[PDB]
Design a protein around this ligand. Structure first.
Ligand SMILES: [Ca+2]
Length: 235
């Protein structure tokens, strides 16, 4: 009828793969906010446009790194402000940002544990990450809900799921870490993560997650992208 009724178009700028400069890259913040916005766009409150930029060949923002969220000409540049903007200013946002301090505290600092483990093979560092995943598993088991705070995705899921994927992919490649099979509720959560469009649409390829850490550790293009999705147990 009228442009007056158009749902808002949100643009998310994300970092490109450091292998080909075109595929989505492996930034956890990009994936988290890609996932939040995808869920909101599924709910048809918004339109989502995802723009990939090659940070060493960029085609307004100056010194700020992706992600950057553009809402009708207004550019949100700091990650904490992107969250706040999604929660407060984008329709659907308040429902996505569930209040659950228990869950916030549960998942806090998970990523630095992965980082420290990757430095080199160290079982003590491996087991520190494993203890945290046990806590998450035991939360999930106690709640018996599909996701962290219930049967619907929230903000905390979009933060957790991308880190579980870097743990699986980079954990295994660099230091032969695997998430053990007795973490039944956690494996069931990942099983569902792989069935989720927001996840699979935003998930970088394995090669890009790996390359991401290789550059971080300064080690060393035709490898066809593949995606780790297997579950080592029956569900
Ligand atoms: Ca940013």
């Amino acid at each position: 009828g009228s442009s007056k009724f158009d749902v808002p178009e949100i643009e998310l700028i994300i970092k490109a793969s450091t292998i080909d400069g075109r595929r989505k890259g492996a930034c956890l913040f990009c994936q988290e906010y890609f996932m939040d916005l995808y869920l909101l766009a599924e709910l048809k409150t918004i339109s989502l446009k995802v723009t990939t930029v090659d940070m060493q060949k960029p085609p307004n923002f100056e010194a700020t790194h992706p992600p950057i969220l553009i809402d009708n000409g207004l550019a949100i540049l700091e990650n904490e402000k992107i969250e706040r903007h999604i929660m407060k200013n984008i329709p659907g946002g308040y429902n996505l940002f569930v209040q659950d301090k228990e869950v916030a505290t549960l998942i806090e600092n998970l990523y630095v544990k992965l980082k420290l483990m990757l430095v080199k093979k160290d079982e003590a560092k491996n087991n520190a990450l494993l203890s945290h995943l046990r806590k998450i598993n035991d939360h999930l088991s106690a709640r018996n809900t599909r996701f962290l705070t219930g049967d619907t995705m929230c903000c905390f899921d979009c933060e957790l799921m991308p880190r579980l994927q870097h743990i699986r992919v980079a954990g295994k490649y660099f230091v032969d870490f695997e998430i053990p099979t007795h973490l039944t509720a956690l494996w069931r959560y990942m099983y569902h993560m792989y069935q989720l469009d927001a996840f699979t649409q935003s998930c970088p390829a394995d090669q890009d997650i790996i390359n991401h850490y290789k550059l971080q550790q300064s080690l060393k293009e035709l490898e066809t992208p593949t995606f780790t999705t297997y579950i080592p147990i029956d569900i």
